[PDB]
Structure formats: structure tokens, C-alpha cells
Write a protein that binds this ligand. Sequence first.
Ligand SMILES: *[C@@H]1O[C@H](CO[C@@H]2O[C@@H](C)[C@@H](O)[C@@H](O)[C@@H]2O)[C@@H](O[C@@H]2O[C@H](CO)[C@@H](O[C@@H]3O[C@H](CO[C@H]4O[C@H](CO)[C@@H](O)[C@H](O)[C@@H]4O[C@@H]4O[C@H](CO)[C@@H](O[C@@H]5O[C@H](CO[C@]6(C(=O)O)C[C@H](O)[C@@H](NC(C)=O)[C@H]([C@H](O)[C@H](O)CO)O6)[C@H](O)[C@H](O)[C@H]5O)[C@H](O)[C@H]4NC(C)=O)[C@@H](O)[C@H](O[C@H]4O[C@H](CO)[C@@H](O)[C@H](O)[C@@H]4O[C@@H]4O[C@H](CO)[C@@H](O)[C@H](O)[C@H]4NC(C)=O)[C@@H]3O)[C@H](O)[C@H]2NC(C)=O)[C@H](O)[C@H]1NC(C)=O
Ligand SMILES: *[C@@H]1O[C@H](CO[C@@H]2O[C@@H](C)[C@@H](O)[C@@H](O)[C@@H]2O)[C@@H](O[C@@H]2O[C@H](CO)[C@@H](O[C@@H]3O[C@H](CO[C@H]4O[C@H](CO)[C@@H](O)[C@H](O)[C@@H]4O[C@@H]4O[C@H](CO)[C@@H](O[C@@H]5O[C@H](CO)[C@H](O)[C@H](O)[C@H]5O)[C@H](O)[C@H]4NC(C)=O)[C@@H](O)[C@H](O[C@H]4O[C@H](CO)[C@@H](O)[C@H](O)[C@@H]4O[C@@H]4O[C@H](CO)[C@@H](O[C@@H]5O[C@H](CO)[C@H](O)[C@H](O)[C@H]5O)[C@H](O)[C@H]4NC(C)=O)[C@@H]3O)[C@H](O)[C@H]2NC(C)=O)[C@H](O)[C@H]1NC(C)=O
Ligand SMILES: [Cl-]
Ligand SMILES: [Cl-]
Lengths: 207, 209
Amino acid sequence: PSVFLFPPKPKDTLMISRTPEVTCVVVDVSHEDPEVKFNWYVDGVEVHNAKTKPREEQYNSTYRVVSVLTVLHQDWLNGKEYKCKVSNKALPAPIEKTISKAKGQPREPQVYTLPPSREEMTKNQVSLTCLVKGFYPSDIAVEWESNGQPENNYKTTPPVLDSDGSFFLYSKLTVDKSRWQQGNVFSCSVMHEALHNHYTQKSLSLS
Amino acid sequence: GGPSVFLFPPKPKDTLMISRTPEVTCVVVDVSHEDPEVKFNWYVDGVEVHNAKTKPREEQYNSTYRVVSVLTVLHQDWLNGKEYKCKVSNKALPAPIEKTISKAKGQPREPQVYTLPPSREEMTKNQVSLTCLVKGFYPSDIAVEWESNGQPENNYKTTPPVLDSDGSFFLYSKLTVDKSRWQQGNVFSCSVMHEALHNHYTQKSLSLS
Ligand SMILES: *[C@@H]1O[C@H](CO[C@@H]2O[C@@H](C)[C@@H](O)[C@@H](O)[C@@H]2O)[C@@H](O[C@@H]2O[C@H](CO)[C@@H](O[C@@H]3O[C@H](CO[C@H]4O[C@H](CO)[C@@H](O)[C@H](O)[C@@H]4O[C@@H]4O[C@H](CO)[C@@H](O[C@@H]5O[C@H](CO[C@]6(C(=O)O)C[C@H](O)[C@@H](NC(C)=O)[C@H]([C@H](O)[C@H](O)CO)O6)[C@H](O)[C@H](O)[C@H]5O)[C@H](O)[C@H]4NC(C)=O)[C@@H](O)[C@H](O[C@H]4O[C@H](CO)[C@@H](O)[C@H](O)[C@@H]4O[C@@H]4O[C@H](CO)[C@@H](O)[C@H](O)[C@H]4NC(C)=O)[C@@H]3O)[C@H](O)[C@H]2NC(C)=O)[C@H](O)[C@H]1NC(C)=O
Ligand SMILES: *[C@@H]1O[C@H](CO[C@@H]2O[C@@H](C)[C@@H](O)[C@@H](O)[C@@H]2O)[C@@H](O[C@@H]2O[C@H](CO)[C@@H](O[C@@H]3O[C@H](CO[C@H]4O[C@H](CO)[C@@H](O)[C@H](O)[C@@H]4O[C@@H]4O[C@H](CO)[C@@H](O[C@@H]5O[C@H](CO)[C@H](O)[C@H](O)[C@H]5O)[C@H](O)[C@H]4NC(C)=O)[C@@H](O)[C@H](O[C@H]4O[C@H](CO)[C@@H](O)[C@H](O)[C@@H]4O[C@@H]4O[C@H](CO)[C@@H](O[C@@H]5O[C@H](CO)[C@H](O)[C@H](O)[C@H]5O)[C@H](O)[C@H]4NC(C)=O)[C@@H]3O)[C@H](O)[C@H]2NC(C)=O)[C@H](O)[C@H]1NC(C)=O
Ligand SMILES: [Cl-]
Ligand SMILES: [Cl-]
């Protein structure tokens, strides 16, 4: 059997009202040795409050069993290490995977808005650009708003590693030219552990 | 419990630069001790070719063999959509396994390239960012660089292609320069190589004011 261990979603870690979870997944579990025992550790100390999910096997030969551990906000953000230890009779010894937040001094993103280029103005639809740079770790969420409303015609690049070891990305919002024209305000919001209140916002409007 | 085959395309830049060597790579994993022998046959639009470079078997740390065969593809053949087939034979298989690969099938689309200058807020910094937006392209194979004067500017990073809502791709490239240099009206240029551009190449420029 094989073990994979997944982190929580960026927003879940940053918002006190949401529930950050770590997920331990076991695949390739045999019918002859189907029994699968999970032990979880938080910086080496065993915890007993994981919620094991029912096994679901479509469609190939084995089965994957997933155990979900809720993590404390402060613990994840302080870099504690979550260990999933999986025991099964088909293994030589128990398998152990360990996950945490990336290690090192957090760095605050700088956020800049850029308007469409002149050449793009000749088009029917235009692109509003949000540059987010200098952040560490790479865990981040970006969204767009207009008129106190979520704008959803955006796509965001994955984080890219910069030369100093920090990260950058860009988010592009697509809007009708005529709408950009007439001076509506559009906003780029960023959630990241190093921002004050884990949140900042920048705005962009026709000049 | 048998061997598995994976077939990889060439790197985007290799397909676009005449001076580089585009290769297709056929990889076989989970080859046992009891049936260690793997045989490769390669086909280019169904016609067998005999000039792949096959490597010796290598024992992996998990106690199976990995065996790889590399076929060089002609630039024009890959770009014209020829289909490369790797057929793998091994005694532990019921029948030979076949994988086929070619360039992506959709309607090609020419990238639109736009340059964007630093934001005002960034101007207060020591170093500023020049941004190149490349969008609307298909397929995703592309290469981007920066120049100032004739010469290659090398303080840039580029995002991978991202899938847009219309099924085409976009990316951004960021060039980092000293504020004082941007100031004084130097020209910087963003160049893009893509199969759908005329001469597979276009260039845009950016300057202060
Ligand atoms: C048998 O079979 C099996 C199964 O299979 C399947 O099926 C089949 C039939 C077919 O189809 C196939 O295809 C499939 O697959 C199999 O299995 C397999 O296995 C394999 C191997 O063996 C593996 O692999 C691995 O993977 C990984 C990844 O993955 C991912 O992704 C994918 C996609 O594709 C998927 O699928 C998966 O699953 C995953 O996913 C994930 O998951 C997770 C967990 O859970 C998560 O997390 C989480 O999340 C959550 C969420 O939540 C929610 C949401 O969403 O929101 C909530 C809510 O409430 C709800 N909603 C509603 C509305 O309701 C939701 C719900 O629930 C639903 O969803 C809806 O529907 O939910 C939360 O948030 C939490 O908190 C968290 O935690 C996530 O999200 C996901 N994602 C996605 C995208 O999806 C990977 O990773 C890997 O890789 C790695 O490793 C490797 C080796 O191993 C290498 O090579 C690579 O490279 C990597 O590495 C790495 O790297 C890194 C860096 O980068 C580092 O760090 C590390 O360390 C490394 N490592 C090492 C070196 O080692 C691989 O690839 C897989 O997975 C599997 N699959 C599955 C599916 O499972 C088997 O195999 C068979 N057998 C045989 C063949 O023999
Ligand atoms: C044992 O071992 C072995 C080995 O391993 C090793 O060692 C060990 C001991 C350890 O240590 C580890 O860690 C190491 O590694 C193993 O093996 C393995 O196996 C596996 C299986 O199981 C596999 O997997 C696969 O993978 C893939 C990917 O791969 C890649 O990546 C990775 C990371 O991620 C890496 O690792 C690898 O290596 C690879 O890489 C690559 O490579 C290549 C070659 O080399 C390259 O290329 C090249 O390059 C050069 C330079 O250098 C030149 O340039 C040339 O030109 C070229 O060619 C590249 O670059 C690289 N990359 C990177 C680095 O990045 C993946 O993909 C896969 O996946 C798939 O499949 C699966 C199944 O199985 C699934 O599940 C998934 O999902 C997928 O699926 C797919 O999907 C897709 C999409 O998404 C699709 O497609 C589609 O289609 C449609 C139609 O239908 C349309 O067309 C569309 O459009 C499209 O898109 C498809 O369909 C699908 N498919 C299928 C389903 O099939 C997989 O995952 C791996 O790979 C391996 N490894 C190796 C190394 O080999 C074994 O396993 C063991 N065993 C035991 C028992 O344990
Ligand atoms: Cl908490
Ligand atoms: Cl050639």
C-alpha cells in the first residue's frame, strides 16, 4: 500500500471561522490484508481525534482509506509537524509521512494593480492584472471584487519562485471593454499569513 | 501487476528552436526480474523507424527495472502533427502495449502580446517590474524572453501557461530592473516564439512615458 498526505486549503488556515484539515490517504490496500490502522502525531505527540472516512473502492484492485485530522490554526501557522503513521499487514514496517507549513521567516506580499495596455483597448474584452510578489510561504488566495460583489471571470497563475526565495503570481480578470470604460472600481484581494488581518485589498479604475 | 508505459513529448523550447533537439521519450516501469527484457518498436504515422536510442535497463530502488527509449523527432514533423507510437513488448504482458503521442490537436491560435509598465506604487521602490502579458494562444507550447538594445535581458521569470476560460492559454513574464534604469526612457522588449506566429516569432517593446 502507498501513503499520501495533504495540507489544508490556504483560506481555511487564515480564517478563524473556518476549519483547516490535514488528509492522510492510503491506496493499493489488498483484500487479503484490508485492515488499516492510523496513528496521528503532532510534533511527535499522539492525538486521537482524527475522523476516519468509510473506504471507497471504484474500481481497480485495491482500496484507499482516508483519515482527516482537524488542525489548530495556531499550530499549523507555527510550523508544527503532522505525522500520519499507517499500519497494515502487507507492509514490512509501518509507513510514516510528515507534513507542515513551509519553514522560514514569513514575508508579506506586495500587491500592485495594472490596467489594460493601450493595444488591448482595441479589443472587445480587456484584462485587469493583479501582480502579487515577495511573499513567503507560497500559500495564498487571490480573488476579485467589484461593487461589493465577487467578480468571478478571473484566472490566477500558480506561485512562481523568485530569485530571493520568495514567490510571485499574477491574477487576470477579464471584463467587457465598455464596462471598464465609465470608471467602475475593480478590486484585487489577497489573503496571506503575513498580512495584517491576513488580508489586503487594492483597487483599480479607469483614468 | 505488470509493466507500465508512459510516453513523453519534447520540451516546448526544443520544438521551437532550430538549434535544439526535440525528443520523444518512451518509459517503461515495473519490469520484473523474471521478465526483464523489453523490446521497443517505434512508428511515425504508422511507418516503422529504426533510429531511436534505447538505454540499458536500470534497477530502481524499489527492485524493479526502468527502461527508456528516446526518439529524435524532426522539427517540421512534430509541428505538422505526425503521430509517434511506442510499442513495448515484454514477456509478462498478454499483448504488446502501445502508446501514441503527437502535438496537441485543437485549432492553433496566435498569442496576443501586451507590455505593461510598473504601477505607480511600485515606483517608490528601488527595483521595479516590467510585465509581459501573453494570451489567447494554443497550443500551450511557447517560449518567452526579454531584450534591451540587441541584447538578452536575463533578470526575468515567467509563469507557466494557464488555461483560460475559452480554452486558450495565457501567461505572464516579469522582468526586474533598477528604477533609475527604467527612468531615463530605455527600451525593453518582450519576445515570444510560438508555432502560430508569422516566422514563429513576435516582439513588443516598452519604454518610459
Ligand atoms: C488503484 O486505483 C487507485 C485510485 O485511482 C484513481 O481511480 C482510478 C480508477 C483511475 O481513475 C486513476 O486515474 C485514479 O487516480 C490508484 O490511486 C493513485 O495512486 C497514485 C500513485 O500510486 C497516487 O499518486 C499521487 O497523487 C498525488 C496527487 O493526487 C491529488 O490529485 C489528484 C488529481 O489527479 C487526485 O485524484 C488525488 O486524489 C489527489 O487529490 C487531492 O486529495 C487531497 C486529499 O483529500 C486534497 O486535500 C484535501 O482537500 C480537501 C478538499 O475539501 C472539500 C473541498 O474540495 O472543498 C470540502 C468540501 O466540503 C467538499 N465540497 C462539496 C461541494 O461537497 C469537497 C468534497 O469532498 C468533494 O471534493 C467534492 O466532490 O471537499 C480539504 O481542503 C482538505 O483540507 C485537504 O487536505 C486535495 O484537494 C486534492 N487535490 C486535487 C487536485 O484533487 C501526488 O502528490 C503524488 O505525486 C507526488 O509523489 C510522487 C511519487 O509518489 C512524485 O513523483 C511526485 O513528483 C510528487 O512528489 C512530491 O512532490 C512534492 C513537491 O512538489 C513534495 O513535497 C513531496 O514530498 C513529493 N513526494 C515524494 C518525493 O515522495 C502522486 O502523483 C494517486 O493520488 C492515487 N489516485 C487517487 C485518485 O487516489 C492506484 O494507484 C491504483 N493502483 C495501481 C495502479 O496499482
Ligand atoms: C518503482 O520506481 C519507479 C521509478 O520511480 C523512481 O524511483 C523510485 C524507487 C522512487 O524513488 C520514485 O520516487 C522515483 O521517481 C516508479 O516509476 C513511476 O511510475 C509511476 C506510475 O506508477 C509513473 O507515474 C506517471 O507519471 C507521469 C508524469 O511523469 C513525469 O513526471 C514525474 C513527476 O511528476 C517524474 O517523476 C517522471 O520522471 C516523469 O518526468 C518526466 O520524464 C520525462 C522523460 O524523462 C521528461 O521528458 C523528457 O525530458 C528530457 C530532458 O530531461 C527531454 O527534454 C525530452 O525531450 C523529454 O521527452 C519530462 O521532462 C519529465 N517531467 C518532469 C520532470 O516533470 C504522469 O503523467 C502519469 O499520470 C498519468 O497516468 C496515471 C496512470 O498511472 C494517471 O493516474 C494520471 O492521472 C495521469 O493520467 C493521464 O492524464 C492525462 C492528462 O491529465 C491524460 O492525457 C490526456 O489524454 C486525452 C485523451 O485520452 C487528451 O489527449 C488530453 O489532451 C490529454 O491531456 C492521460 O490519458 C492519462 N494517462 C493515463 C490514465 O495513463 C503517471 O503518474 C512515474 O512517472 C514513474 N517514475 C519514473 C521516474 O519513471 C514505479 O512506479 C515504482 N514501482 C512501484 C511498484 O513502486
Ligand atoms: Cl483552532
Ligand atoms: Cl529537424
